[PDB]
Amino acid sequence: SWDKDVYPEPPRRTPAPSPQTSLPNPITYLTKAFDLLVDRPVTLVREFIERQHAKNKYYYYHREFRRVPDITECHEKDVLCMFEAEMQWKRDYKVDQEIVNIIQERLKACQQREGESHRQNCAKELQQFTQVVKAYQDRYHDLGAHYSARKCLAKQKQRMLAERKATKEAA
Amino acid sequence: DAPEKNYERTMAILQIESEKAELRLKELEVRRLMRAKGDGPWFQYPTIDKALIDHSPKATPDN
Numbered sequence: 001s002w003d004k005d006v007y008p009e010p011p012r013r014t015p016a017p018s019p020q021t022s023l024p025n026p027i028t029y030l031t032k033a034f035d036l037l038v039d040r041p042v043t044l045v046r047e048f049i050e051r052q053h054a055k056n057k058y059y060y061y062h063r064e065f066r067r068v069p070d071i072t073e074c075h076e077k078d079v080l081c082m083f084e085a086e087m088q089w090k091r092d093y094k095v096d097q098e099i100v101n102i103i104q105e106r107l108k109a110c111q112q113r114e115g116e117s118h119r120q121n122c123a124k125e126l127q128q129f130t131q132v133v134k135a136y137q138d139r140y141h142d143l144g145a146h147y148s149a150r151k152c153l154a155k156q157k158q159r160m161l162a163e164r165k166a167t168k169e170a171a
Numbered sequence: 172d173a174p175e176k177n178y179e180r181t182m183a184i185l186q187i188e189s190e191k192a193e194l195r196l197k198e199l200e201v202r203r204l205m206r207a208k209g210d211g212p213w214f215q216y217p218t219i220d221k222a223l224i225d226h227s228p229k230a231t232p233d234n
Contacts, residue, residue: 063174079185087178 006102010113065091071149082149089149093140103132 019025068088074081107122107129114121138159143151205211 079189080182083182083185 008106009109071153086149089152093147096136096140100132100136103129 065088068084069081070088071082071085074085103125107125110122110125111118139156140147140152143155201211202213205213
């Protein structure tokens with residue numbers, strides 16, 4: 001299983017079955033047939049497999065990366081420090097890519113689970129998606145396929161010069 | 172191999188190659204200054220040895 005806070009799923013409200021006619025639906029009989037023929041032998045095989053899983057217990061971990069000094073506090077043309085800052089920036093690049101993927105999965109899951117009212121009932125998901133796409137486009141877009149820490153730093157400096165001129169001209 | 176192994180091995184390779192690149196730039200600048208100024212041990216094209224000179228008293232004195 002996973003976390004329901006990073007993967008939000010609202011509480012399912014299913015209605016009670018209210019039969020109007022006397023003709024039986026085939027679906028409950030097929031649900032019973034699927035439960036007896038299929039679901040219980042699958043569950044029993046999973047029980048045997050998990051009892052074989054439980055005899056030996058060992059753990060894999062998440063690789064923790066302590067933060068090395070980034071590219072702004074590296075000297076120029078010093079490959080030992082800017083190599084470390086480069087690996088740090090590339091890992092942050094992959095992690096932010098997967099953050100954008102998580103927010104897209106949230107958006108697509110919302111648009112499916114809210115039915116036809118998905119234009120109304122996905123306001124927060126679309127808002128968070130627009131914010132994370134705006135942040136990702138400010139950060140990593142237009143770097144080119146030879147992307148590095150210097151390219152992202154120079155893009156940040158060009159954007160901050162544009163913001164400084166925009167605040168200076170509007171004051 | 173470990174990512175630790177490749178990481179620290181990469182840093183060793185980068186140290187060795189960066190030191191060689193800095194010393195190649197120093198090699199170029201030292202060669203430029205020694206051809207230009209001529210006061211280094213390189214490019215010492217030979218002049219006349221002064222151990223070849225006769226310093227004995229000659230026959231005519233104005234020399």
